[PDB]
Ligand binder design. Structure first.
Ligand SMILES: Cc1n[nH]cc1NC(=O)Cc1cccc(Cl)c1
Ligand SMILES: Cc1n[nH]cc1NC(=O)Cc1cccc(Cl)c1
Lengths: 304, 304
């Protein structure tokens, strides 16, 4: 027992990290097969980032201007193309450490591990959620661009995120591996509104189930609620409205604990209306929304 | 910017994980060079765990009874020895993936990453602290025994922990890589008192510094305190007494922020005496003690 903000083992992703330099800019690239994927802003200088004309900037670049280094060895670039906000650098050598992989677009409210890198070198790994507003609250300094988000199902790594930018508000924005930004963001040094964020209700409920499985039960009560009544409370507290799909995804946890989803909702309703009264749940003093129902089951059953 | 509970990249440790089976018991082993390290309770059955005579149990075991498997390949065991609470299984093949490594005994209050494993396979990675009472609050189910705790300084992995047991209270206990338990624990299925725990003061202060570096400053005040006065408050709130050594270790953070250590102590004093008033610091509603001053500097400077 015990419940932690657990990240996937980062080994398979570490073997893919490379450094990409273009002119004065260095960031991280992901080397899968004979292609290196990196943020397209690697081609920019300080003056460009205010409103870059990426097409024009890229035209002044040739294959030999993209210096790709996998630790101590240099990769030979034989092609370059821009797809949305990513550059795809064709190299003459397929990565020997390429794991089985997929590029996937995650949905808001889903979680993933981030392998934070600098100069193509891994610094650390953490688990996070894609906020309902498409931002991520990560830990990314200058040069972390190109660090990726992923999930692992047995031997297959599904890459879902590539880091690109830190908004003036300190939150993070990036793209899928086809270079499409999550959210309304643009790779420009400009103030950009991130939408109103909400708390991921299904995840808080999954975490209340994890708490019950792992011994923390003080918040369970004699009450129940309806999806309509709960959603009135969720509206007041800036929580995502709960749907039957979310209830259905919580099914396995409801079955394991024997606590009906709407009974758990009434505990959440009371916690929202009264707070924790200076108590904790799984070592937290707030309602945690970065564990999905799948994360809770995987961690509580020890899926490797 | 941004501050997360970041674990070290687990790649170098993943390449060392093996499965060890002896009779009906299977757990994880760490394969470094031509030796596999695992908890000695792998030799026990259900009936034995109440009060095992490990020396007697081990005498009935031969090299061929220890089945060691590194994924799909089987390792040939040519020797076995018990050192404290670990078994050292000499194998005929040195691990090709052995990183540069050290075995170290960490001090209480220090942090490390745990690569949680089942059947010699990695399931996830998380960062945790060795509590002042020598326990760890991990996430470990049955079969996670043999999963290890470590730190990484550039290319060297310092292994500091091997998981052995979950106490009746749900907290975790284990050993250094020489098999010495951290704390008064014994590898027996018996109720065992863990000492009175305290909050790691130097770590909370390091985390208040991380909060200031990363934008959260609401808790800073116009006050200062002394080590004597602060320690009177720390005594009342079950916090470790602050010493000049802790102040000295906070030096770099005090220098970067320009906030004197005793000024930060007065902010901590006010937070202890008044609580957070329903506010958060770095996404937390409690005072976090699982980041050391070294962790804060490493994460805030992007050491790879
Ligand atoms: C400070 C930081 N953290 N994570 C990423 C950064 N760096 C940036 O955001 C640099 C940058 C500026 C403007 C637009 C874009 Cl796409 C990129
Ligand atoms: C449930 C669990 N979590 N992490 C480890 C376990 N398993 C155990 O504690 C099994 C066990 C029982 C008694 C003594 C010892 Cl050394 C080991």
């Amino acid at each position: 027992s015990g419940f932690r903000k657990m990240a996937f083992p980062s080994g398979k992703v570490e073997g893919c990290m490379v450094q990409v330099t273009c002119g004065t800019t260095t960031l991280n690239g992901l080397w899968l097969d004979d292609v290196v994927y990196c943020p397209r802003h690697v081609i920019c200088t300080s003056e460009d980032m205010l409103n870059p004309n990426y097409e024009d900037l890229l035209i002044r670049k040739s294959n030999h201007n993209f210096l790709v280094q996998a630790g101590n060895v240099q990769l030979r670039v034989i092609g370059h193309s821009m797809q949305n906000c990513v550059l795809k650098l064709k190299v003459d050598t397929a990565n020997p450490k390429t794991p089985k992989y997929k590029f996937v677009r995650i949905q808001p409210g889903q979680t993933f591990s981030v392998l934070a890198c600098y100069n193509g070198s891994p610094s650390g790994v953490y688990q996070c959620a894609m906020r309902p507003n498409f931002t991520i609250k990560g830990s990314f300094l200058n040069g972390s661009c190109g660090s990726v988000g992923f999930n692992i199902d047995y031997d297959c790594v599904s890459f879902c995120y590539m880091h690109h930018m830190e908004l003036p508000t300190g939150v993070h924005a990036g793209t899928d591996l086809e270079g499409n930004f999550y959210g309304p963001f643009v790779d420009r040094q400009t103030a950009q509104a991130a939408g109103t964020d909400t708390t991921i209700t299904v995840n808080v409920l999954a975490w209340l189930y994890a708490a019950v499985i792992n011994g923390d039960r003080w918040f369970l009560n004699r009450f129940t609620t309806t999806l309509n009544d709960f959603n009135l409370v969720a509206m007041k507290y800036n929580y995502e409205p709960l749907t039957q799909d979310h209830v259905d995804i919580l099914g396995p946890l409801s079955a394991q604990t024997g606590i009906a989803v709407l009974d758990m909702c009434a505990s959440l309703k009371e916690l929202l209306q009264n707070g924790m009264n200076g108590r904790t749940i799984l070592g937290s003093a707030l309602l945690e929304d970065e564990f999905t129902p799948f994360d809770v089951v995987r961690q509580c059953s020890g899926v490797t």
